[PDB]
Every structure is written in C-alpha cells, then in structure tokens.
C-alpha cells in the first residue's frame, strides 16, 4: 500500500546517484552504493534531506559521508552536496548517524566520526576511534526575476567531545551518538538531541544532550532511559519532552521529562509499549520519525515504524501512526507491498505531507521521496471525527444553567450507535470491538445466548497495543439493562486477564438473587446491592494505583476500592468483555443491552462520573450518525 492519490520518486538512487566526493582538495562526482538514515526537514521554505552516503558497501562499518539534497520547489528538483565528510583515514572512515535540528535558517547536524574501527561502535573497548561532531549549515534564499534559488553553506565540523563526562550517575562512559533522523528546538529555545550512549559495560542507553546557547556548549540531563534503549527520537508535547526509543527484541519504550532530561518517567499512561518491533515483538527495532505537528488546527503526533513481518533486520511494511496522545490511529502502510523499508522521516510543510524513506533489496539501499497525498486525506478525515465527537460531548448541556461539562480528557474509545454485523465501531475510529449474537439497538447492542457479547481487544490488539495504558489506569463506563434473570451469575462488563475471561482484573456480574457481583481481581466475590429486571443502570469501573472501584448509578458499591494487582508486577489485560464473554467456551448466557461504552485512560473523578451518569440519555451518537 501507498495511498490512492499518493506517489514517489527514487531521490537517492542506490548505485546510481552521484555526490561531490572531495579528497585531498580534489572533488569527483562519485557513485554511491547505498543511502541510509534519512532526515527530511524544512528550513524557512527550503526542503532539505540529509542521509548517509555509503560509497562502496551498505555496511555500517565502511566509507561514509553525509549527503544533503535541497529543493526550493517542494521536491520537484534538488541540488546535491556533501554536508560532512569523513577523515578519509582508511577504507572505514565514516561520519555516522547524522541527526538534524533546524533553528531559523541554520541546520545543526550531529554525527559520530570514526577513523579505522572495524567493529560496531557499541562493542568498542574505549573511545580511541571516536569523535562527536557538530557541523552547521546556513540556508539562504535569493530571487532572480521570478526564480527562487537557494544555497547552503556548510561549516567545518566542531568536536563536542569536551562536553562528554567521564562518569554518568555511577557508571563510566565510553561513547555516544545522535538518535539519527530529526531532533528539536525546545519551546524555550534549547537545542535538544536525544542521544545514545555506552558505558564501560557496553550497555547502551538514551539521554538528553542539549545546548542552551545556540550550540556553543552542551549539557547532559542527569537521568536516562533504561538499558538497551537506542536510537531515541524526541518531540516536545505540552511542556514535556517525549522520548521514544528503539529497544531491540522488546516493545518500544517511551518516556516523558519535564526537566530537560534530569528525571525521566516512563509514559505508561499513553505511548510507552504501544508499538512492537515485529508481530511477536521479538526482532530488531528501528529508527522512527516522531514529530509534533498542527493539522487542521489540532496539535498531533506522527510516528512511523516498519511492521517487520519478515523479521531479522529486513523491516518491511513501513507504517504511519497518528496520535493525539489519547487515541492512536494506524494511518496505514507507506511503503509499497512487501518491500523492505526501515528508516523514515516525515515532513509536514505548507499543509502537504511528505516522507523520505529507505527501500532495500539485497542490502542495497535507496531513499524514496513520497508525496503522501492519500495519507493526509485519512489523517484529515480522522481528525475531523475526533474534533466532532469531542465537540459533540463538550457541547452537551448536562442536568442541574447547565451542570459540569461531560469530560473528554483522556477519552480514548467510545462504543455507541454505529455497529456492523460482527463489529461495534469505535467512534474515534481506532479500535473496534467484535461482537457475537449482537442485535443492534439505539446507541448499543442487545446480546443473548452462549458466547454472546462484545470483545474490546487490549493485549489482543497484538503487535501494536494502543490500549496498553489500561494496565496502569483506566475507566470503563457503560449503560446497561438486564432482560432475564440468570441461572448462575452472568457477566456484564470487565477487564480480562486471560483470553477466556475466567481470570479477571476488575469486572461486574449479576446473579439469580437480583444482586451485583463486583469482582475485584482474585478476591472472593461478595454480592452486594440489588438490581431489577429491565431497568437501565449506569456502570463505572475505575482502576488506578492498583486499586479498583465499581460504581452503580454513580455510587460506589459496598466493598469497592480494593487492591486488584497483588504483586508489584504489571498486569497484562487481554481484553474488555461487554454484555457477555464473547466465548462460546464460557457457559454463561448474558441477556442484556449495553449502550455508550466509554474508555478513559485515567481514573475519573467523582464529578466526572456523576455528570456521565446524569447525561446517559444524551451522550449517544444516534442522531449525528
């Protein structure tokens, strides 16, 4: 897949494109074997693409310069230069992992520099072959007659080594490198590079390496990522740095830091561990584009990562993700079919969307320049929906002027009026729930029979788990109505720890005695309260700080607020079950109607809950389609 309407060109064409190779004061147009590590940026209207020019071989340990192409016509035509050249000291002299920051009309490029080491940088025993260099480009725009003509003057690189400490909290240092791709200017004007760093134990980890003074001098924030986080990419989001890391053979870790990387906190309630590196999350990781942009007046993030069905380092099926830090939408595949396409950089300029990404066959790497027309289409469509539901809900005037607004902060998923034969549609278009034995009713579904119910997938989302936040905190809200008295004790709503629904984290059931059975974790279940057949009730499950609550009609049940997470291990929620288990495997027959399921990524406060309870007649999506 590349969208309908989208298109591309082979901009850095492997074993074809030539570059001004300078050595001993003579320049030669030289063919390049492979191009890798793309970074696509916009400098004051001038599109600039920076990458690895790997001259003879694709290998990381080979002769490599840093190539820059720039266009003044949104990528129709380009000029080519080398921005940073290596030492020429040996056949493996190289400037590696170029990482780019744009500020004003200046391009700050940060590269590793090696002279003759043949082993991978992380396995080195000391820093003898290494320098870290900062080179700056000045971008200029002239206009003869009608015609726009740019030029970029590159500075001689400067070593930043003097800013590299001997010791970081309780370990000794070896080397460090940029995260590759595009870094940022913090809203306070600091230059911020997320960097990968090795200690003497040859562990890798990520830090924040920043300059407060336009890159004259550089500091490291005190804290770090966990070990094995490499190739970090960062963006700034509501005053915090969000650092998104490659972790080989594990799911991507994401961190927040409000204090320029002095303290790092794992973003468990949003994006951390959402993205897996491969279906089974058991393969090598990747370089990711991760940018904050404003599209259709909404502030959003765009993330890319290959799905890597092939496994090993092939990294086929480059995917684009859209997030508002609440909802996570898979825009789709950007690469074309089963082609290998790992590293990527996404640029949003003048309301048009572009991507510079790798294509790899047989370890010969090109970079394509893709006009993501169809992708923007979808993005714009999804945002519209998000804006509209959110608007719709805030717009509701609640019961006794108007009461407090319906909350949409941390509102992630909404199951309401729209449903297909086998699926209940998320209003926010991110994660549907599947259904069986479901009959459509206003704003929800009537279920009946064995195996009846709806399943909202959590860990069961598979390779990318957008709902992973629920393991730390969530609120699940729904309107329910019971139509038949059960022969045992039947399920209504809950968070399942196993794929059958047997083992629950937190849930609600109802019994033959006309009582509620709130289930807190593995705690012996004590039935409480009473319900009558055919009356509609408001059900709220909240879980935060390992404690679960259950509210009926906005009142917590007796015995509510118990520990559901015994050890200090994290839960791994299988799915949410609604109106049954949706397993023919379980013997229960839940005959109920559920309406307006809401999912929030935090615990709702007493007032937000109470609002929702009074508003249950007017939150539904029925009218609006």
């Amino acid at each position, epitope marked *: 897949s590349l969208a309908p309407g989208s298109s591309r060109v082979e901009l850095f064409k492997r074993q074809s494109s030539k570059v001004p190779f300078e050595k001993d004061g003579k320049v030669t147009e030289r063919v390049v074997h492979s191009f890798r590590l793309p970074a696509l940026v916009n400098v004051d209207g001038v599109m600039v693409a920076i990458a690895d020019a790997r001259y003879e071989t694709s290998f990381d340990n080979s002769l490599i310069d840093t190539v820059a192409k720039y266009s003044v016509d949104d990528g129709e035509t380009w000029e080519t230069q080398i921005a940073i050249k290596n030492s020429r000291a040996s056949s493996v002299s190289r400037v590696v992992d170029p990482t780019v920051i744009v500020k004003g009309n200046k391009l700050y490029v940060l590269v590793g520099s090696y002279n003759s080491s*043949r*082993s*991978y940088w992380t396995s*080195h*025993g000391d820093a003898r072959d290494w320098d870290i260099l900062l080179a700056v480009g000045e971008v200029t725009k002239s206009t003869a007659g009608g015609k726009i003509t740019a030029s970029i003057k590159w500075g001689s690189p400067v070593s930043l080594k003097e800013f590299f400490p001997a010791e970081m909290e309780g370990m*000794h240092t070896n080397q460090f490198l940029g995260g590759a791709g595009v870094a940022i200017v913090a809203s306070n004007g600091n230059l911020v590079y997320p960097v990968q760093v090795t200690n003497k134990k040859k*562990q890798v980890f990520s830090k924040i390496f920043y300059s407060e003074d336009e890159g004259k001098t550089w500091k490291f924030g005190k804290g770090r990522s966990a070990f094995g986080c490499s190739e970090p990419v960062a963006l700034e989001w509501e005053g915090k740095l969000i650092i998104n890391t490659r972790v080989d053979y594990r799911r991507r870790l994401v961190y927040e830091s409000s204090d320029m990387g002095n303290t790092w906190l794992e973003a468990v309630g949003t994006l951390s561990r959402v993205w897996g590196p491969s279906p089974k999350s058991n393969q*090598p990781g990747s370089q990711s584009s991760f940018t904050a942009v404003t599209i259709e007046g909404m502030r959003v993030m765009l993330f890319t990562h290959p799905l890597n069905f092939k496994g090993r*380092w092939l990294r086929d099926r480059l995917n684009l993700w859209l997030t508002d830090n609440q909802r996570i939408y898979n825009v789709g595949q950007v690469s074309i079919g089963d082609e290998n396409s790992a590293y990527s950089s996404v640029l949003y300029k003048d309301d048009k969307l572009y991507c510079l990404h790798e294509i790899n066959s047989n370890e010969v790497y090109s970079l394509v320049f893709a006009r993501l027309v169809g992708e923007l289409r979808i993005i714009k469509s999804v945002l519209q929906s998000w804006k509209n539901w959110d608007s719709h809900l805030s717009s509701i005037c609640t019961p006794a002027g108007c009461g407090p607004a319906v909350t949409t902060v941390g509102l992630v998923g909404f199951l309401s009026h729209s449903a297909t034969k086998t699926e209940w549609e998320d209003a926010y278009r991110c994660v549907n729930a599947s259904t069986a034995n479901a009959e459509r009713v206003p704003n929800g579904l009537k279920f009946a029979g064995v195996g009846g119910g709806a399943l909202w997938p959590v860990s069961q989302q598979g390779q990318n788990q957008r709902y992973h936040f629920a393991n730390h905190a969530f609120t699940l809200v729904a309107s329910v109505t019971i139509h038949e008295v059960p022969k045992g004790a039947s399920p209504l709503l809950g968070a399942s720890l196993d794929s059958s629904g047997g083992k629950k984290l937190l849930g609600l059931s109802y019994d033959k005695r006309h009582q509620w059975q709130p289930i807190y974790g593995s705690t012996p279940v004590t039935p409480t309260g009473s319900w009558e057949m055919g009356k509609r009730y408001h059900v709220v499950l909240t879980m935060a700080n390992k404690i679960g609550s259950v509210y009926i009609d906005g009142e917590p049940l007796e015995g509510s607020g118990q520990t559901v997470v015994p050890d200090e291990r994290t839960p791994d929620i299988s799915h949410f079950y609604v109106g049954g288990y949706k397993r023919s495997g379980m013997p229960t027959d839940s005959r109920v109607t559920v309406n307006n399921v809401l999912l929030y990524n935090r615990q709702l406060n007493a007032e937000e809950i109470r609002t929702l309870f009074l508003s249950q007649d007017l939150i539904g999506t029925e009218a609006h389609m």
Partner: antibody
Amino acid sequence: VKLQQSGVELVRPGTSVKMSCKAVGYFTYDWIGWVKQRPGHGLEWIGDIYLGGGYINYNEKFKGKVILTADTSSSTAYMQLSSLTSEDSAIYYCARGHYDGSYFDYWGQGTTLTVSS
Amino acid sequence: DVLMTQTPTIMSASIGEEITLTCSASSSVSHMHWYQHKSGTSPKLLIYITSYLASGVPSRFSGSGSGTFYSLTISSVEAEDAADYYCHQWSTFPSTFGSGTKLEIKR
C-alpha cells in the same frame, strides 16, 4: 608486543595467590583480560581490567573469588584468588582485549595453579 | 550471558577437504571471534570481528556469520589442524566463550 605471566603455583586449600601479567614490547592503555582453562571446561572469562583507567568488568560467577588490580606505571595486571579450592585448580591465561570489538590477540604463556592438601 | 552453542561437539574432516564449524548465540551479537586451542599451548586467535584473519594465521581459515549464528571454515584441512576451537563474543557483558568443538582428522 607480548605478555609475561608469573610462575607455577601450588597451594593448600583456603589460602590466597596473586598472579602477574606484565607486557614487554610496551601498549599504552588497554584492557587486560583473564581466562580460566580447566580440563572438561573449555575457557571461562573471568574479567578485564583497564591499564591506565582502573575500570574493571568482573564475571559475576567469580565475584567472591577474584580481585583484579593493575600497576599501570610498570604496566602489570594482577589477578588475586581468595579462599582457594581444588575447583580453582586450572591454567590461568591473561590476554589483551583489543579496543576494536574486544578480541584477544596477544595471550600470556599461562600460569598453572594447583590447589591440594 | 549470551550462551554460545557449538555443534556438534566433535567433528571429523578428511585431509585437504573443507570443514565448517558453527556457533549459535542465545541472542544476537555484533560479531564473533574464533580461537584455536591445543593443550599445552595458549589459545591462538584465528578470526577476529566475524571474518578478519588474525596475523600469521594461514588463509585457509575463513570467517562468516551475522547476528545470531556464525561460522568458522577451513579451506583445506592440515594434519596439524586437529585441535579445539572456541567462538567468543564480547558485544554484551559478560563476555562468553563457545562450548567448543574438537576437530578430528580422518585417515
């Protein structure tokens, strides 16, 4: 470049020994590592110590037993083994762990240790 | 502790023929080293960083491999090539050696 280790050792269980590994053809700053070779047991990595830096990486299996040191003026590394047992009876080799991916190219001649009553 | 599994334990090879030894890492590493060991001597470095030939080692010895599985090959074996062979990674701590494969000559 070369590594010259100390002489044959014979000791009663429970004592201590300190092995040397000094290089002639002297080079400037590097990791010197230690390997235990026992029959039936291939080669076991003990640890490296960094001549002209002091940094050490211990293999945790040997946490109690081994203490590494280095006099970087005379450029000699010392391995010391505490509270010995027939377990520790082996040939001990030192070698230099080249910076470029840490391979051991120059090895010592080996120091043979015998722990017996 | 990436564990290095060298299979099989003992391998036979006829004079002048080629043979390959394997080394199978529990987890991915940047590269392998290979050593020859004959009891009484010290270990001898044969291949460093996966594929480069140590100085003075005869070019019948070849090195290949990638990520999780590496190979040592003798172009055409010599009587004297009967020995123990060890693979070795030091790409993550702690450094670990192979289980070792012994070469027997067929005659």
